[PDB]
């Protein structure tokens, strides 16, 4: 089924009706004409949409009228400019470096008393070594506009300047980036003597991970213990009390992982150790068949969850009575984990019939991956136009359709079908799976693609023996996404596997993650 350019400017902005523009941008089928107005049709004008656009109507990056003059002067003219204009232009560390010495003199000098911030970054490029000047004055702002001028800058921070990196909304990043990229040794080691009371959260628990890589159990364990007190998300808090328990081996710690309200590796695995009881799995079973709602219309996915996001408690009841039936299960399954504010554990299996001859392992995975890629969509589409149950990028949806399948008349929507999405998934894993054995493996690279995977398994550092393995590399994966995803994906699979009678112990999978 197709859409004409003009049906879809009569549908709701959505991803749904992004990616159908973006299949007719990608077959030549938008004329000039037929893009001039097309911006206000888009919900979000980001990545591939947006250069197919700009091949067609190229924009010039808006700039103020209010500065437009300010612009028309280079390094060469910019004495000749009035003040604000001065000051705009100095906004860009690439604008500084081209500047002259003796203008950077100048204009350091006329900036002094109202924008010291720019007559330290003016006499720091006049040097050949402007990180060292900013760190000298220890001036935050400059240094965070230095960090994202250039990562290749590096210097040993004192504790006093340190101590000052949190209170800015850079330091999150900043922490997160150099920590998994193993880049600016001398900032990292710095970063040892980070206060953990300055800092929490995300950039507590960063800081706890940086502590081990330096053996610095005692830092650690106090940073882990900040992130576990600071984080909204219990699961967080988990991944954290984890640690304290790795470094410090409270029983305490062990014991308040395996009470925890959130079903994760780190709960499921304390739950074992101490044997706890596998948590409480919801039986969702509705007697009514179906209703009216098509899960094969995308467009209608877009609207309801919408609607879904945006319920009052009330409306949710309403909601949870219509979608409560078999051919609708994963969207009833999607209302109730919203009327039950996530405290609530739900693992169905829907259109169970099209996995059901596949050995339990196996069903396991493909309903793991299912359930973190898509919550069982049918119509799924990610911001990338992944499609369906198990979130194919058209790419490798086309190259198992037509090249290696030769399904007759296969388009990527064939994706949005049940058959297709489990049949399709199946294949991939069976090539995942044959490549790199662990399903932790395998999750990292249904995601983030087996060259990814097979270049971070390569490391001497990643998924080796030592004290703190396998956990450690697991918070070290190098791209954040498929770092959470497969924490999310093994927990997933350990009880699939427990609700298909065919039960592994989550130590099993962490043993077989260290390669002898
Ligand atoms: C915190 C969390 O896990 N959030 C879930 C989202 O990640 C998830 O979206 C899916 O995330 C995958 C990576 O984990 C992507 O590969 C995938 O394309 C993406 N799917 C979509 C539809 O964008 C959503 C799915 O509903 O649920 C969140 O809870
Ligand atoms: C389910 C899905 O569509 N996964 C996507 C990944 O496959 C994809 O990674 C790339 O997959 C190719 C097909 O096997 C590999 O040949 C390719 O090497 C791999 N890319 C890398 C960097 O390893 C990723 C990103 O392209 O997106 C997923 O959504």
Redesign the pocket.
Same mark, same amino acid.
């Given at each position: 089924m197709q859409y004409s350019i003009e049906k879809l400017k009569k549908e709701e902005n959505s991803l749904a009706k992004d990616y159908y523009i973006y299949r007719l941008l990608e077959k030549n089928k938008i004329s000039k004409k037929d893009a001039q107005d097309l911006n206000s049709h888009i919900f979000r004008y980001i990545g591939k949409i947006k250069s197919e656009l700009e091949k067609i109507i190229p924009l010039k990056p808006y700039i103020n009228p209010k500065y437009a003059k300010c612009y028309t002067y280079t390094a060469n003219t910019i004495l000749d400019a009035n003040l604000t204009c001065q000051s705009v232009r100095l906004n860009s560390l690439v604008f500084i470096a081209s500047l002259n010495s003796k203008d950077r003199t100048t204009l350091a000098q006329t900036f002094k008393n109202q924008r010291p911030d720019l007559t330290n970054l003016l006499l720091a490029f006049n040097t050949s070594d402007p990180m060292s000047y900013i760190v000298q004055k220890e001036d935050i702002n400059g240094f965070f506009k230095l960090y994202n001028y250039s990562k290749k800058y590096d210097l040993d921070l004192n504790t006093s300047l340190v101590n000052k990196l949190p209170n800015h909304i850079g330091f999150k990043d900043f922490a997160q980036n150099i920590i998994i990229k193993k880049e600016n040794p001398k900032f990292r080691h710095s970063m040892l003597e980070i206060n953990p009371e300055n800092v929490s959260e995300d950039s507590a628990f960063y800081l706890g991970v940086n502590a081990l890589t330096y053996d610095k159990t005692e830092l650690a364990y106090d940073f882990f213990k900040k992130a576990a007190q600071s984080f909204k998300s219990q699961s967080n808090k988990d991944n954290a009390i984890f640690w304290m328990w790795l470094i410090k081996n409270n029983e305490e710690d062990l014991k308040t992982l395996s009470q925890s309200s959130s079903l994760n590796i780190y709960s499921l695995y304390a739950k074992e150790l101490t044997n706890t009881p596998f948590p409480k799995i919801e039986s969702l079973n509705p007697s009514k068949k179906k209703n009216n709602f098509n899960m094969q219309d995308p467009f209608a996915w877009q609207k309801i969850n919408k609607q879904i996001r945006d319920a009052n408690a009330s409306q949710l009841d309403v909601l949870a009575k219509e979608f409560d039936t078999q051919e609708t299960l994963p969207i009833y399954a999607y209302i109730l984990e919203r009327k039950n504010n996530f405290k609530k554990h739900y693992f169905i299996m829907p259109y169970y019939d099209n996995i059901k001859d596949y050995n339990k392992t196996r069903q396991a995975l493909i309903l793991a991956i299912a359930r973190? *890629?898509?919550?069982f969509?049918p119509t799924?589409?990610?911001?990338?136009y992944?499609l369906g149950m198990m979130?194919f990028m058209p790419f490798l949806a086309n190259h198992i359709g037509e090249k290696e399948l030769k399904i007759p008349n296969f388009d990527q929507d064939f994706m949005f079908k049940p058959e297709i999405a489990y049949y399709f998934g199946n294949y991939h894993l069976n090539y995942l799976e044959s490549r790199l054995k662990s399903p932790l493996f395998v999750a990292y690279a249904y995601?983030g693609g087996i060259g990814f995977t097979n270049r971070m398994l390569a490391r001497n550092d990643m998924f080796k023996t030592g004290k703190f393995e396998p956990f450690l590399s697991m918070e070290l994966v190098p791209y954040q *996404?498929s770092r959470?995803?497969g924490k999310?994906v093994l927990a997933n699979y350990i009880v699939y596997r427990h609700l298909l009678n065919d039960s592994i112990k989550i130590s099993d999978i962490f043993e077989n993650l260290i390669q002898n």
């Amino acid at each position: 089924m197709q859409y004409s350019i003009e049906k879809l400017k009569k549908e709701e902005n959505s991803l749904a009706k992004d990616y159908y523009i973006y299949r007719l941008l990608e077959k030549n089928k938008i004329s000039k004409k037929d893009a001039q107005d097309l911006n206000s049709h888009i919900f979000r004008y980001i990545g591939k949409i947006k250069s197919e656009l700009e091949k067609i109507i190229p924009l010039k990056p808006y700039i103020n009228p209010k500065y437009a003059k300010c612009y028309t002067y280079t390094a060469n003219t910019i004495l000749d400019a009035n003040l604000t204009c001065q000051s705009v232009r100095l906004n860009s560390l690439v604008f500084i470096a081209s500047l002259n010495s003796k203008d950077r003199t100048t204009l350091a000098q006329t900036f002094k008393n109202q924008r010291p911030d720019l007559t330290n970054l003016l006499l720091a490029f006049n040097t050949s070594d402007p990180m060292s000047y900013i760190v000298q004055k220890e001036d935050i702002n400059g240094f965070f506009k230095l960090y994202n001028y250039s990562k290749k800058y590096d210097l040993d921070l004192n504790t006093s300047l340190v101590n000052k990196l949190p209170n800015h909304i850079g330091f999150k990043d900043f922490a997160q980036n150099i920590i998994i990229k193993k880049e600016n040794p001398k900032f990292r080691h710095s970063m040892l003597e980070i206060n953990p009371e300055n800092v929490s959260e995300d950039s507590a628990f960063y800081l706890g991970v940086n502590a081990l890589t330096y053996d610095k159990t005692e830092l650690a364990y106090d940073f882990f213990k900040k992130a576990a007190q600071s984080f909204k998300s219990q699961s967080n808090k988990d991944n954290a009390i984890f640690w304290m328990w790795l470094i410090k081996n409270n029983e305490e710690d062990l014991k308040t992982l395996s009470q925890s309200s959130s079903l994760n590796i780190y709960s499921l695995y304390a739950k074992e150790l101490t044997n706890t009881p596998f948590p409480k799995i919801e039986s969702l079973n509705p007697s009514k068949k179906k209703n009216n709602f098509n899960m094969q219309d995308p467009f209608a996915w877009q609207k309801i969850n919408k609607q879904i996001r945006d319920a009052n408690a009330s409306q949710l009841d309403v909601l949870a009575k219509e979608f409560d039936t078999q051919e609708t299960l994963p969207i009833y399954a999607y209302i109730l984990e919203r009327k039950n504010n996530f405290k609530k554990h739900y693992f169905i299996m829907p259109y169970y019939d099209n996995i059901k001859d596949y050995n339990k392992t196996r069903q396991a995975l493909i309903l793991a991956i299912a359930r973190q *890629e898509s919550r069982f969509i049918p119509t799924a589409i990610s911001v990338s136009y992944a499609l369906g149950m198990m979130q194919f990028m058209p790419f490798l949806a086309n190259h198992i359709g037509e090249k290696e399948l030769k399904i007759p008349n296969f388009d990527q929507d064939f994706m949005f079908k049940p058959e297709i999405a489990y049949y399709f998934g199946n294949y991939h894993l069976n090539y995942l799976e044959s490549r790199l054995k662990s399903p932790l493996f395998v999750a990292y690279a249904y995601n983030g693609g087996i060259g990814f995977t097979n270049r971070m398994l390569a490391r001497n550092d990643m998924f080796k023996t030592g004290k703190f393995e396998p956990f450690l590399s697991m918070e070290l994966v190098p791209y954040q *996404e498929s770092r959470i995803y497969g924490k999310k994906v093994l927990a997933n699979y350990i009880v699939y596997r427990h609700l298909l009678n065919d039960s592994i112990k989550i130590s099993d999978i962490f043993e077989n993650l260290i390669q002898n």
